[PDB]
């Protein structure tokens, strides 16, 4: 029985998750701390490359 | 060799799927303390025709000369360490080179070049 | 690893055993259970008489709509048969058990057959072809027989 719930509008009808038939359309941030580290490692490798400007 | 790492499944793969130049370093024996103290080297890869004494197993306290380093079976073959089959014919029994220390080295001028390389002095 | 029972005096008892006989289990069951109290020579006499069809093997457990015969009144039955392939494979085993008595030093004329046990071996797979395109099994069902026999004299 539906009650006093908000009218949902959840917008997930366009084959977004990878199931056995769908490649998916999905973007996950599991490499967020490793690209965080990569950009800093590559800014310290670049600050050496330009030195002393 | 650097077989031991963080991953057991990868470490235990690089041990049992090791080439025979890796299996030579892995199949090493300690030196006797009158011989460790001379060359200042603690352990040594086992060759054929160098003399050893066995330290673990039922054959502990047995001397003899290494007649085969059977690297595919991970074992060593001493002539004096053997038993007989049902026929009465004798067969050499394998020992791992952990259970064994070297009492005389078989020296060539490629083996005398490993001792100068592992010399701790 | 196979004998269910051991003899009382093992120095007066000869063993025999079949690995996988490839007779029928349900016929070597009754061929062999009938000699479980007999002497060696009275058990051998029975088998030469089942071959001559003068005495029969009583089928008491795996009988199930076999024909009833006039010779099963010896055993208090009504139905029995003459399974000649299970008979002559039990004669090869009684001859093994008495050869194993002679090399122990025993008289085979004094051996009472203690302990007959027949058990089912692993079955063997073939195939029969039924109607309408069906294929359905055609198994073999062989057996394991074991016996010792203990000497009872004087």
């Amino acid at each position: 029985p539906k009650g006093n719930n908000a009218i949902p509008h959840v917008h997930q009808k366009k084959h977004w998750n990878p199931c056995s038939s769908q490649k998916g359309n999905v973007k996950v941030f599991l490499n967020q701390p490793a690209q965080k580290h990569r950009r800093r490692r590559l800014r310290l490798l670049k600050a050496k490359k330009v030195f002393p400007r | 060799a650097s077989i031991k790492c963080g991953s057991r499944r990868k470490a235990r793969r690089a041990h049992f799927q090791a080439p025979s130049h890796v299996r030579r370093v892995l199949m090493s024996a300690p030196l006797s303390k009158e011989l460790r103290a001379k060359y200042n080297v603690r352990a040594m890869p086992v060759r054929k025709d160098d003399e050893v004494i066995v330290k673990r197993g039922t054959f502990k306290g047995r001397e003899g000369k290494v007649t085969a380093c059977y690297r595919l079976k991970w074992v060593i073959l001493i002539d004096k360490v053997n038993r007989e089959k049902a026929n009465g014919s004798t067969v050499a029994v394998g020992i791992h080179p952990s259970n064994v220390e070297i009492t005389k080295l078989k020296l060539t001028h490629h083996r005398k070049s490993i001792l100068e390389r592992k010399d701790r002095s | 690893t196979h004998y269910s029972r051991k003899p009382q005096v093992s120095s007066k008892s000869a063993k025999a055993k079949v690995s996988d006989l490839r007779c029928h289990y349900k016929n070597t069951f009754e061929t062999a259970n009938v000699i479980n109290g007999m002497p060696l020579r009275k058990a051998q006499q029975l088998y030469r008489q089942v071959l001559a069809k003068t005495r029969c093997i009583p089928f008491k457990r795996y009988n199930g709509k076999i024909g009833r015969t006039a010779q099963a009144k010896e055993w208090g039955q009504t139905k029995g048969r003459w399974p000649r392939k299970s008979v002559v494979a039990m004669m090869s085993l009684l001859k093994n058990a008495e050869a194993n008595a002679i090399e122990k030093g025993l008289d085979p004329n004094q051996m009472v057959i203690k302990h007959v046990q027949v058990d089912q071996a692993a079955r063997m797979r073939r195939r029969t072809y039924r109607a309408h395109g069906r294929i359905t099994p055609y198994m073999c069902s062989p057996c394991h027989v074991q016996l010792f026999m203990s000497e009872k004299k004087e």
């Binding site: 998750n17 056995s20 996950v28 599991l30 | 963080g6 991953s7 057991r8 499944r9 | -």
Partner: protein
């Protein structure tokens, strides 16, 4: 996985259940059921996804008030002792040593420090408990388990080299204190060794009640809900026992002889 077959249901009219079954013939898997949580070689119920919630986010003040609470309980010697640590010979809790140990360069000299500050009874608790882990996890790069011994808090990142090799002693930096190590297991009261100048900058890091911290902007220590946490001394004080009800003479008890009823 479990779905890479071309299986279809045989429908109805054969005496077989209505599930998808492997197409083809000539093999032992042909005709076998597929595509369900109960078929073998089929797919699991609700197959797991990488977009599960793995990481959690905790409020910044509520992470600070949990690091402070586990750090307050290391000063209590009753809670450090009821958590496993063998602090029976330790001089004081909170133990504080000088900064000469941040220049040791041999592990044999760091081991004589723990023998002298009597924190070697908790390193020798961790060495004994080294065993092989029970279960599946030792196939999964988790072979050995030990206990958590003493934490050693340094003022900064240096001077660790004599202490890195001791099995059992944990190192820490006071500018970055982890709650995973100050209360491991969820249980407060880690034994901590606290060098001199890591202990003299612990008011700049966390502040006081009336004075904020320099490191953590705007963070004063949270106010105590009770000024005096000893609520049984209130229950037994002479000005609370003054206003209590007088304990009246109660009724005489029963007997082995029953009652008339």
């Amino acid at each position: 996985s479990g779905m890479n077959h071309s299986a279809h249901s045989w429908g109805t009219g054969r005496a077989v259940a209505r599930i998808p079954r492997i197409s083809g013939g000539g093999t032992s898997t042909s005709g076998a059921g597929a595509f369900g949580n109960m078929c073998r070689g089929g797919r699991m119920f609700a197959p797991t996804k990488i977009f599960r919630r793995w990481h959690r986010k905790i409020n910044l003040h509520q992470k600070r008030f949990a690091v402070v609470s586990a750090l307050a309980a290391s000063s209590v010697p009753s809670l450090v002792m009821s958590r496993g640590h063998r602090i029976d010979n330790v001089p004081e809790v909170p133990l504080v040593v000088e900064d000469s140990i941040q220049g040791y360069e041999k592990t044999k000299e760091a081991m004589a420090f723990l023998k002298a500050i009597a924190a070697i009874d908790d390193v020798n608790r961790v060495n004994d408990s080294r065993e092989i882990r029970a279960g599946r996890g030792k196939m999964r790069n988790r072979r050995y388990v030990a206990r958590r011994g003493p934490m050693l808090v340094m003022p900064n990142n240096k001077g660790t080299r004599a202490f890195r090799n001791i099995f059992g002693l944990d190192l820490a930096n006071v500018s970055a204190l982890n709650l995973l190590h100050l209360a491991p297991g969820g249980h407060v009261g880690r034994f901590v060794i606290w060098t001199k100048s890591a202990f003299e900058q612990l008011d700049k890091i966390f502040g006081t009640f009336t004075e904020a911290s320099a490191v953590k902007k705007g963070f004063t220590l949270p106010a105590p809900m009770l000024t005096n946490t000893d609520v049984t001394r209130i229950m037994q004080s002479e000005e609370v026992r003054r206003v209590l009800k007088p304990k009246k003479l109660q009724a005489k008890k029963a007997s082995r002889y029953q009652t008339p009823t």
